[model samples]
Target chain A: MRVLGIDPGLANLGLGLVEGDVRRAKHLYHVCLTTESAWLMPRRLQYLHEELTRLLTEYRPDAVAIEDQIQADVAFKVGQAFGVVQLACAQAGVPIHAYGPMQVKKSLVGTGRKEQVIYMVKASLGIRELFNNHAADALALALTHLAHA
Target chain B: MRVLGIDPGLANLGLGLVEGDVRRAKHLYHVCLTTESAWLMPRRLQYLHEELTRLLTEYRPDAVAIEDQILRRQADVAFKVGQAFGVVQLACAQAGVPIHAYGPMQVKKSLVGTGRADKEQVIYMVKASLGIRELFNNHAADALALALTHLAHA
Candidate 1:
């Protein structure tokens, strides 16, 4: 199943998608959607909603996976951004899932270390080129969903 | 100048409009926009976005005043509230309505002369200031109170 995985934040929000099932996967796309730093919070959220909705309309993934942790563990400001991202997902009417950092790391590399998880995601997907960390983590989130779902 | 004050929440988002400034203000409109709990968060937010946008278009307030983040006990609660906050600000921003945020303490202090004033005291003051007899929803009352607070500070 194609899965759209997002790493949400006020800035450098990640959108990455994968095609195929747990045994085999294709790294279809990845991008780190960042808004102008000068923009106010609402305008930034508006931009994010616009861009993400476009992606949803274009790619049309079956399910969405998001990287989220304990809500209390995140900065209060980030919490607001997460809401906008969820709104976008809801608007698309896609089945959504959240994967914590620990689950992603363990499912991908058998360790909770970021360094190893990145290495394994590329190695498993045969990704020859390097990508932004946010996008890379987003892939792993999608992978986690595939492995579990 | 007209002011739109909002009390943002996942379930009972509040909106109220006031005319004039701190010296004397008139209540124009107020509503506690609610969405069904059975609805997923995204749909509820969609409802909020649609309704608030209508208000911005209808009233065309000069400024938007919203209650800032109120710390909640649970992470889920905080995240849910934050989501609504984002929607409210977005509606104001997109509509080109100048937006302002007030903490509960500051709003309470502005209304009742003390930041730690109880809800009832703030409610009483809001009723008296707005020249109203009764308020059913506290969030809607807070929306009106915030509109007055903007007047008091403006």
Candidate 2:
């Protein structure tokens, strides 16, 4: 089943969509939605929600997989950002599954280190070039979830 | 001018609607929307959004005011809960209703002249100020306080 994986963030949200079954999956697309922190809080959130809704409508994935991690330092911001994505998915009627970062890393790269996961993604995806860390992480998350599907 | 004040929370969202100018404002209605914590997070937020949308449509308030506070212990939960507030703000923005945020201390101080006033004191003052004798839960009381704060500030 195709799955949309998300790395939720306030300033930048990472998104990756994978298409295939448990045996074989390929990255369909990878991108990030960035918002200007200079904007008002409500506007920023509204913009994120609008963009994400557009993405979900365009892709129409079978399910959504989101990285679930709690950062006590930036909990409120992270929480609100994550909430917007969840709201978008709910509105689109896509089931959402939350995978812990450590769990996703361990599943994909046999390790939980950020660097290892990135390298593993690059090696497996056969892409010598990378868009950015958020995009890579999002791809890794989709790969991890697809691997277990 | 009409004002809609909200006490944002995940489980129980408090709301108060007031009408008239700053000098002579009257309470129109007060209510709370309750959600079960047992429900899924996204569903709970959507439910809140639907209810608040209904309220906004019914009342068509000219302005909206919300409480601005963060609980460290309930950070993640509070964030999800704050989604309700965010949804309300978005609705207000889309409807062209001006939104205002007030801290708890400011709400308390504006009503009772003390930032550190206890809940009971605030409740007493709300009853005394509004001339309402019915007892209200804390969330409803907080909403009334926020509404009054908007009135006084405006």
Tens-digit lDDT track of model 1 for A3-102: 9989877779888889888788888888998887798788898888889889999999999999865645354567678877877788788878988888
The residue pairs in collision within model 1 are: B22-B151
lDDT of 1 by residue, B6-122 (tens): 988888988889898777788798889988889887788888988998999998999988887557567766777778888778788879887778998989889999888999999
- The root-mean-square deviation over C-alpha atoms between each candidate and the true structure, in angstroms, is 2.8, 2.5
How big is the RMSD of model 1?
2.8
| TM-score, every prediction | 0.86, 0.89
Quality of model 1 by C-alpha lDDT = 0.84
Q: What C-alpha lDDT do the candidate models reach, one value each?
A: 0.84, 0.79
Q: Report the C-alpha lDDT of model 2 over B71-110, residue by residue, as the tens digit.
A: 5675666567656666666556656677799998888898
